[PDB]
Design a protein around this ligand. Sequence first.
Ligand SMILES: CCCCCCCC/C=C/CCCCCCCC(=O)O[C@@H](COC(=O)CCCCCCCCCCCCCCC)COP(=O)([O-])OCC[N+](C)(C)C
Ligand SMILES: CCCCCCCCCCCCCCCC(=O)OCCCOP(=O)(O)OCC[N+](C)(C)C
Ligand SMILES: Nc1ncnc2c1ncn2[C@@H]1O[C@H](COP(=O)(O)OP(=O)(O)O)[C@@H](O)[C@H]1O
Ligand SMILES: Nc1ncnc2c1ncn2[C@@H]1O[C@H](COP(=O)(O)OP(=O)(O)O)[C@@H](O)[C@H]1O
Ligand SMILES: [Mg+2]
Ligand SMILES: [Mg+2]
Lengths: 17, 17, 715, 715
Amino acid sequence: NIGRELTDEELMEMTGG
Amino acid sequence: NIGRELTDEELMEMTGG
Amino acid sequence: KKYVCVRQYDLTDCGAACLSSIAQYYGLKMSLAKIREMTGTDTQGTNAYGLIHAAKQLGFSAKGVKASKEDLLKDFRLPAIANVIVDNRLAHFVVIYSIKNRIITVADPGKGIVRYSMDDFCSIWTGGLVLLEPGEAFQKGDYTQNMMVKFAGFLKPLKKTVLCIFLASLLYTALGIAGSFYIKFLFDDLIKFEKLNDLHIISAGFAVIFLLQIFLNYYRSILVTKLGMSIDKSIMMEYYSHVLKLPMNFFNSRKVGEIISRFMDASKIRQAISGATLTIMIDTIMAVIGGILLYIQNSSLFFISFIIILLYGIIVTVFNKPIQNANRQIMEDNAKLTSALVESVKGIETIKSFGAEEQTEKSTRDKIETVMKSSFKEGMLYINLSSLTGIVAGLGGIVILWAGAYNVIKGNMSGGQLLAFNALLAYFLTPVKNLIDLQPLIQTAVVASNRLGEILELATEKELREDSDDFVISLKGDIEFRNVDFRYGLRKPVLKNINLTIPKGKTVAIVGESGSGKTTLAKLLMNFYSPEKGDILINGHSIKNISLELIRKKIAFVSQDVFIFSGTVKENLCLGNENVDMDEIIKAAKMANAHDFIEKLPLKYDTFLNESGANLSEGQKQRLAIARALLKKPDILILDEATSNLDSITENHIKDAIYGLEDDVTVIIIAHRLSTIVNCDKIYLLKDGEIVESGSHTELIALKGCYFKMWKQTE
Amino acid sequence: KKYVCVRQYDLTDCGAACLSSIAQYYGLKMSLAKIREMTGTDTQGTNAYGLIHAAKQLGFSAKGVKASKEDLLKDFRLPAIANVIVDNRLAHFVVIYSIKNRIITVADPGKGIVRYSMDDFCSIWTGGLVLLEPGEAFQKGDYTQNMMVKFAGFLKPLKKTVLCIFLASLLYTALGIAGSFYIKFLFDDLIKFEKLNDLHIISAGFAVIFLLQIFLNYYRSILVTKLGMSIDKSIMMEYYSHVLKLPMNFFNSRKVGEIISRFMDASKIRQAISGATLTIMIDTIMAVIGGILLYIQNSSLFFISFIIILLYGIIVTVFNKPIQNANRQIMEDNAKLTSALVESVKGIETIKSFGAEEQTEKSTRDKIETVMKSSFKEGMLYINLSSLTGIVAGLGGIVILWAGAYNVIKGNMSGGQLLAFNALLAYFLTPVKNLIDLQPLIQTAVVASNRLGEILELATEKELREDSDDFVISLKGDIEFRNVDFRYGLRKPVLKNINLTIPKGKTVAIVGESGSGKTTLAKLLMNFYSPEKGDILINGHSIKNISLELIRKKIAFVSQDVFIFSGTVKENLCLGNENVDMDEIIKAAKMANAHDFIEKLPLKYDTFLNESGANLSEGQKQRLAIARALLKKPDILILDEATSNLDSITENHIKDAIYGLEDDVTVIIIAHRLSTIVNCDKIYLLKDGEIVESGSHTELIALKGCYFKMWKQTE
Ligand SMILES: CCCCCCCC/C=C/CCCCCCCC(=O)O[C@@H](COC(=O)CCCCCCCCCCCCCCC)COP(=O)([O-])OCC[N+](C)(C)C
Ligand SMILES: CCCCCCCCCCCCCCCC(=O)OCCCOP(=O)(O)OCC[N+](C)(C)C
Ligand SMILES: Nc1ncnc2c1ncn2[C@@H]1O[C@H](COP(=O)(O)OP(=O)(O)O)[C@@H](O)[C@H]1O
Ligand SMILES: Nc1ncnc2c1ncn2[C@@H]1O[C@H](COP(=O)(O)OP(=O)(O)O)[C@@H](O)[C@H]1O
Ligand SMILES: [Mg+2]
Ligand SMILES: [Mg+2]
């Protein structure tokens, strides 16, 4: 828990280059 | 006076890169 | 447990490095390249979805959430991966290891284990957070190999060369130790007793000893150079030959610089495989003998020299890490400055047009100031180190002379013995100095060995292939695409449900918008990458059941961005075909409108093309690629927007050459402009990762749909 | 005269270097950058036509001719420029200085003055030949400036810092010379007479002297580092600030690497502006004092040491040139190897498709073998030099000890004096060694100074402008192209007779084949380059009379190869405008289909774009560039194929936005697809460097001609 789970699209949108 | 006097096209074709 | 911080090898594997750090913290260790490929790391970095997928593959139970500033106070699973925005410019992944009193400890793969004030972290921290936790199946492992032994195994063929160097070094050391007693023999015996003939004889003997020592050093240096060059060649050739066999998911997930920079890692490895082992073997014995002799001369002076070398080693070890941190910062600043300079020079036209020659100069001046500051920091570190080392060395020498004079006064030794001790100080201190100085070299060599050898473990293109059926020798037949999904790594899927059939030998057309995914199918037909689901069938037989060799010779490709190799025209037109006569090349040059072009070039089909054929324009290179593909003699030929850069006459000649092609060969034409290809046997219009309607132009126009709308809007 | 061999600064100025060599041979010396400008040297090298034109402009009477082997046997004017084909791959220019009996002397700018056998030369020599001869007006000159004196002017503001370094160095040298007598005091006075309290006091005094010496070294090193950093920053900033103001014929006639590599020349210059002058000033005095003191100690040993240093200098001077030649060969081999590796990695698609993984590995193996051979040659040179130097040094030290022992026995000196002589040998030999070792540094620094400072002599764009009328404040009006010629450098002309009229505020279109010369028209309209003949008129007045700052401000350009700089979106959209609100950026973003696109991106108009906007696709950058163009608020807006890479909806929206553009704003659209632009007010069709048809779509279609044929064959 501890946060708001992102969906798949938001996950892929979380770029970490 | 030693050869054929090249023309402009052959002069620009005489690449020396 | 100890906080594991796996430093990133590349600039884009920060997420892979963070996942590897979490795995190592939880007891699982593996190659960084493997984790990099399961995370779906690309040239643009890693996203959270890739990290979650790779963690779940590894056995973790990952979950990506967005948290607020208050959630850091609430206790959760401490080893989590978090997003940060370095310099407020670049995204980055870090590892939070503990939630302390207003202080945050994070492993940054680019820097190390650092601490931040909660204000600073929360200023740079983005809401993104990834939580990792082992699942039911997380069997701890150590699936990595010691890469130093693997590259040290290259010394086995050269055992004789290493043995000769050892003997030459032993003799050199013995001769030097013997010659370091000349000053003792002078003052104690010859000068004191006024011996002249003995003086001349002994001096000549020591000169001969020194000449022999020089010859031995010459021979040993030659041998060491040869050994180093051989090891360099072996390692570089191994790496390159393996890289050329790796699949295509390796090449497009990395920049050219990343792949090429591993060639310096070969030299970095050689510097320890040859230099470090030989230095250890020689200098250990040389230092032991020198120390024994020094203690023979005098115990007190030997103890003083030991204290000197101990202090030097302590100082160097203390100054080790800050110097390398400063060097890394300097390298980063120089990279930023040179990138800015290249960008400013390349885009000069825009800067001149918009009158930005003033702010560009200011930005470059600021970057130069940053580089100068980093250089001054490193120079200050080196100056302090040199000052401390010089203090230690000079005061040690003065103290040794002082104590030696005291001992000579007390009668414990003679002046000649003191001078001989000063001479042997070199043969005692230089070995230990070199052994201590091996520390920076070995760490760099270990890092380079890991970087280079983690690629040599990757499975090649052939090793990943399913068993080949030997009954197929002809690719002629229908090309069937079943329900085929595809995606470049772990990004959004490109192909969704493309089911289609291409008859035997009939010309086929594929059209669509840019970014639709046509080149993706073109590459999937050539076994570059593989479908995620479904299968690709040729004449009933699946492609995966056919030998990878037979795919690559019987299928020809003309990509939109053609590539020309530095070589003669004949060499370019016959890349893999080692046995072709001139007439076939001539004929292939006919239908591709290349004979007329290259005939006007100087000489004939032998001109070396400089810098990937930079002399020729785009159309000429495209015609060359067409000629090469035709000369390949394929059963299937694919043209991915090949005629876009050509003129009208060349396009017409290409069209009537392709249409009038002999033998039962299939032709696929991938185009963006519909008017270019209208007389094809069948046309497939795919818009969103799937075909929506297939048929001839007479059939597509009559049936109202996407193709009709596109034809009306473009024409 | 002497055979002048002007070494080429870059890889493509071999012809310019040959012409400069001929001019210097005949007595004319000028900047190589200026000659490189006159020859029309491009990134692909120089042709014979450029050499002839530049020679005629310089006063020569030049001509070109093709010659055979028998022509060389005949007598003509010796200093001629000739073609060679190195490695039967690369064309190059050399200067034939003399034809001796069956041997050829050529200055090759890449190597030096070399000799070839007649058969080998004729094998590598193309029949082309350039004959040069001074004409009526060949006033000999020296139109160059001593770049070392020019760059030494940066020491004038920092004279106080140089003074402190000199004083600190003098004190350091004096303290070291004073402290070198400790060994003399020990043996001659303390040890011999068994003085203990004096021993302790004197040892403490010498330790204090050494500590003072270390402090002085620390301070001097800090000052020297600061001085070097300041000089480096000054030189690089001057060079960059000048480069940013140069015309466009400078930037496209040079590669990016050529412009960027001058930044290391700044460090190479600084290494002699600060390092060499300080070294000379300190070491001359230090060596004089050391030699005087050595001669005071003993004459014979001083003469032996002088002979030692003479031998060392002789050896180093002899080995100077071969080492630098080997290093240059190594650099060239490494460049070839890395170019091959980059080409192989970039074009892995074609290699895999054609099964060329075996021959590529063989080629890379051969190149690595060549690199290893060059490295071994250089290593052998270094080993020979080090062996000779070690022989000289060690045998000289043994001989000094031998002769000193003889002198002590004979009573000419004392043992302590001999040991003090051994100590002062450092302060005598190190300064002379450094002065000798400055020789390679000065040559490299002079080459770098010439390379960097020849650019600083080039006239900037704003200095080449004519008198500017200040009453012209608006560019709104008709645009007239009179009889206008153009050519890029000294190549074949691109535009021949471009005569046209653009009515004010009317949308106008230019269409044609690829490479026809439309982008050349667009760049000519913006003062990028100037027409060879004729003028470009805006509202009657000529362009050359309009202020350069104004015309670049009131003309907006959207090229096909748009460049996005590494910065925030708001910074990219406002490149030169530093006083802009936010609503009008929003508005300009709406008309370019970028507002919704950028809003969907994370954050707001503040996202830094990594690696020149690599994350954005081509269409996204196209939209951003268009938005910046409108944002500029121009009087003339040129759109060079900005709608080619966009989709249908975006292209339609852009077209209707630019068509309904407020105010009397002239719009010019350069397009390759005719159907993209049909409602334009006027259409210009230029085919062979000339407009052949002008009119509307209804008029051009009706009039049979090139336009009608193109429309029929493309639609
Ligand atoms: C701070 C670093 C560590 C220090 C911690 C511990 C330090 C303490 C010791 C450390 C090492 C011990 C070595 C010698 C001492 C052995 C025992 C002894 O005292 O007797 C010896 C003293 O002989 C001497 O005079 C030597 C003086 C001692 C060294 C001075 C400083 C220590 C090292 C500095 C390095 C500087 C380098 C760094 C510069 C920055 C024997 O003398 P003797 O003449 O045979 O006796 C009479 C003979 N008779 C009977 C015939 C009459
Ligand atoms: C690649 C080449 C390597 C060669 C390496 C050799 C090193 C070069 C240096 C040696 C040159 C010195 C040779 C001369 C030897 C010599 O000549 O030794 C001087 C001492 C003789 O004594 P002297 O000078 O006459 O003093 C006065 C004596 N007295 C008679 C008045 C009492
Ligand atoms: N080398 C690559 N790495 C990652 N993604 C890619 C790569 N090439 C293409 N893609 C993605 O796959 C999709 C298919 O594009 P592509 O087929 O190359 O365009 P086109 O159909 O015009 O040739 C694109 O949207 C692009 O985002
Ligand atoms: N930077 C350059 N240097 C030398 N020649 C050039 C350069 N740019 C263009 N040219 C030449 O000028 C001609 C005009 O091409 P261009 O106007 O760029 O084509 P387009 O009108 O399709 O943009 C081309 O044939 C090309 O060879
Ligand atoms: Mg494509
Ligand atoms: Mg163009």
